C-alpha cells in the first residue's frame, strides 16, 4: 500500500464499531455473530495473544423473540 | 487374525499387496475379510515386459500403467 510503517500498522489493527438490530431476533442467533466480532474471528490477522477486537452495539433488546416455549421453560439461576 | 495378517504381507496399513486368486489364498482372506480392502488388478497395457519394469505405476482405481510419465 506504500504506507509508512507507523500508519500501516495502525490501519491494520484498527477497531471497528458494528450495529446489530434486535427487533424480533432470537438471542442465540444474535449472540452467535456478536461473539465472533468481539473475539476478532472475522479478521484474517486474528491471534489470541493480540488485542484484536471490535465493538458491537446491539439495540432493541427488549423485543427479542425466544423460539418455542423458552419464555416459560428456560430458567436463569444464581446463588 | 493377527497371524493371517502377518503371513499375507499386510503388516503395514494402506500399502497395496498383490495376491493370487487361487482358493488357497481366498481361504485365508475370508477370515480377515473385515480388516482389508480387495480390488481387482486391471491391466490396460497388459503385463509389463523386462524393458518397462522400472516405469510401472499403480493407480488408485486399481489399474497398473506400464509406461508412466514418458519423456
Amino acid at each position: 500500500s506504500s504506507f509508512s510503517k507507523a500508519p500501516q500498522q495502525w490501519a491494520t489493527f484498527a477497531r471497528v464499531w458494528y450495529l446489530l438490530d434486535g427487533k424480533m431476533q432470537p438471542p442465540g442467533k444474535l449472540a452467535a455473530m456478536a461473539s465472533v466480532k468481539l473475539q476478532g474471528l472475522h479478521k484474517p490477522v486474528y491471534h489470541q495473544l493480540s488485542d484484536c477486537g471490535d465493538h458491537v452495539v446491539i439495540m432493541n433488546t427488549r423485543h427479542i423473540a425466544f423460539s418455542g416455549n423458552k419464555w416459560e421453560q428456560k430458567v436463569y439461576s444464581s446463588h | 487374525e493377527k497371524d493371517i495378517i502377518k503371513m499375507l504381507g499386510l503388516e503395514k496399513a494402506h500399502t497395496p499387496q498383490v495376491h493370487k486368486n487361487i482358493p488357497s489364498v481366498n481361504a485365508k482372506l475370508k477370515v480377515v475379510k473385515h480388516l482389508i480392502r480387495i480390488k481387482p488388478l486391471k491391466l490396460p497395457q497388459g503385463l509389463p515386459t523386462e524393458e518397462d519394469m522400472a516405469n510401472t505405476c499403480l493407480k488408485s482405481n486399481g489399474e497398473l500403467v506400464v509406461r508412466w510419465l514418458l519423456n
Binding site: L41, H42, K43, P44, V45, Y46, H47 | -
Partner: protein, 140 residues
C-alpha cells in the same frame, strides 16, 4: 585406593544452567531443580508435537475469517478449490489472505464459480457437459 568425585561442581552446573529462569527455590536448590528441569524437557517435546497442530488450527481460522468476508464458508471454499486442481496448502492460503487481499478474492471468486457449476449439473439431467471450469486435465 579411595576414589572421590571432584568435578561435582560441573555435575550440578549442567542442570542449573537450564533452570536459571525459574521462580522460587527451584532455581537454587539442586533437588528441586532436577524434578523441574526433567518436567521442563518433557513438556518441550509434547508441545513440539502440538506446535504443528496449533498452527494448522490458526491457519484455518484465518482462512475462514477471510472467506466469510466474501460471503463463502470455509467448507465450500476448500472443496470447490480442490475441484479446480489447485493444490495450495492452508499455510500459503493464510498468507495470501493477509498480504494478498486481491488475489485471495480471485481464489474466492474461483471457488464460488466452481461451486455454482456443480449445483447446475445436479439440477439438470446429469448429462450436461462438464463446466468450463470443471473440466479435469490429466497430465500423462
Amino acid at each position: 585406593l579411595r576414589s572421590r568425585v571432584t568435578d561435582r561442581y560441573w555435575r550440578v552446573q549442567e542442570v542449573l544452567k537450564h533452570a536459571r529462569h525459574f521462580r522460587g527455590r527451584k532455581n537454587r536448590c539442586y533437588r528441586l531443580a532436577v524434578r523441574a528441569v526433567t518436567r521442563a524437557f518433557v513438556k518441550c517435546t509434547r508441545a513440539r508435537r502440538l506446535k504443528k497442530r496449533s498452527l494448522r488450527t490458526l491457519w484455518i481460522n484465518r482462512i475462514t475469517a477471510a472467506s466469510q468476508e466474501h460471503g463463502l464458508k470455509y467448507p465450500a471454499f476448500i472443496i470447490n478449490l480442490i475441484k479446480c486442481q489447485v493444490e495450495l496448502n492452508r499455510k500459503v492460503l493464510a498468507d495470501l489472505a493477509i498480504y494478498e487481499p486481491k488475489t485471495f478474492k480471485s481464489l474466492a471468486a474461483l471457488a464460488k464459480r466452481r461451486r455454482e457449476e456443480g449445483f447446475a449439473a445436479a439440477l439438470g439431467d446429469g448429462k450436461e457437459p462438464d463446466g468450463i471450469f470443471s473440466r479435469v486435465v490429466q497430465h500423462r
